[PDB]
Each structure stands twice: as C-alpha cells, then as structure tokens.
Amino acid sequence: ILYINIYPIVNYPETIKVSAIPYYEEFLPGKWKKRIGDLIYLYGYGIENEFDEIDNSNALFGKIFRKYLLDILSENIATPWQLKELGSTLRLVKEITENYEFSNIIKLQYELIINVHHWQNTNFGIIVDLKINILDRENNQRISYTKIKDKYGESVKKKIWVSVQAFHRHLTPEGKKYATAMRDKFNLLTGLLKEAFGSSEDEKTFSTPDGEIKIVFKPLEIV
Ligand SMILES: C[As](C)(=O)[O-]
Ligand SMILES: [Cl-]
Ligand code: NA
C-alpha cells in the first residue's frame, strides 16, 4: 500500500463563470484572474456582471481551475499559518513554537508548498511538500548551516540539524533513527495541512462563487 503526497479534490464546480479581456502590458497578476495566451480570464470573486460559463469538458476549465483552487485555498488559511506566496504555487508558513535548544537565536518555520496536479481530464489534487526554513532570529533572514557554524559555532549547527530532523519526524524527538519514520512523516504532513486550512475532520468543503470545493485530507493510495 503506497501513499503519495497528493490530496484529492473530490468535489468541485462542474461549471465556472469566467470573463475574458485582452491581455495588456500593464497587467499585474493577482487573485481571481489568469493570463492565458493573449487573454486574461477573470473568475471567482473577479467576475463582474458580464460572464460566460465553462465546464470541465473544456480545456480552458483546467487551466483556470488549477489557479482558482489555490486562490480559494488562500482565503481559508487558519492561524497560525501565513501566506508566503500565491501564484502558480501556494506557499504557507508557520513558526515552530515548540521548545528546542538554541530557539532563542535560531527560528524554525514549517513551509507547506502546495501545487495543483491535474490528470485524466477531470481529476484534480493538491501536491503538498513540507520544508523547514531555518532563520537567524535576530534578523529573521534565512541562515545556512555553514553560517550557523561560523556565527554561533559547531555545536549549535549540529544541534539545529538534529532538531530540524526531529521536527520533520526524520528522527525521534531524542534524535535517533526509528523504524516507522515514513508513516509518521506522512501523518505530520497530513496533520499540518489540516491545521493550515482549519480542518478537524479528514475532509473539508470550501465555498466558492460557483459552488463547493471538497478536499479529502488523506493521501492518495496506490495499492
Ligand atoms: C470578496 As473576497 C472573499 O475575495 O475578499
Ligand atoms: Cl497570470
Ligand atoms: Na460539484
């Protein structure tokens, strides 16, 4: 039983309202709109009175829905997660607030990286990657292990790496290898994804102007 980091959208609007205008140079990309070739399509909360409807049998549907999906998710982020990047990709972050040695000088931050996967014409899912960013707490900037070693010394470097591995569940909280690591790492991913979208249940529905989007917070299974 193989589990993949893709969380399926099991319901979405089979029809969505879109507006098209010609692309123009001053266009600034943003929510509720997408450039497609030499048109910009408005959708979701960007729809003015003027509109056309497109269904999932149309190639345009997937090109729009892949972005609309992220736009909606971006409207449903729960504290303490924050939006870091929205566009073709959705990145959310939160600070690791549990204790670890050298937390006073080194800030750790989980980052969920959310992309949309589309396959067999009508299937959508979010592909979700988890990274931990390591920040120098005094200036809130990214800091490499080498720079930690130079600035705070070898001991801090080594300890941070163990803490990072423990927060990824690559090691036990005590810093040791364990047997059940890929199961627990998936549970962590699923649990953080649930938290980030305010979900206590293994599925959640999100409202859109076109109808509901339903996501199941359970990784796809290849048996
Ligand atoms: C109208 As809205 C949910 O895009 O702020
Ligand atoms: Cl765009
Ligand atoms: Na539907």
Residue numbers in the entry: 20 to 242
Paper text:
Although phylogenetically classified as a long-B pAgo, AfAgo contains only MID and catalytically inactive PIWI domains, akin to short pAgos. We show that AfAgo forms a heterodimeric complex with a protein encoded upstream in the same operon, which is a structural equivalent of the N-L1-L2 domains of long pAgos. This complex, structurally equivalent to a long PAZ-less pAgo, outperforms standalone AfAgo in guide RNA-mediated target DNA binding.
Comparison of this 172 aa ORF to a homologous sequence found in a nearly identical AfAgo-encoding genetic island present in the genome of a related strain A. fulgidus DSM88774 revealed that it contains a premature STOP codon due to a 2 bp deletion. We were able to solve its structure by X-ray crystallography in two symmetry groups: P1 (resolution 1.85 Å) and P3221 (resolution 1.4 Å). Two full-length upstream protein chains found in the asymmetric unit of the P1 structure, and a single chain found in the asymmetric unit of the P3221 structure overlap with an RMSD of 0.85 Å (determined using PDBe Fold).
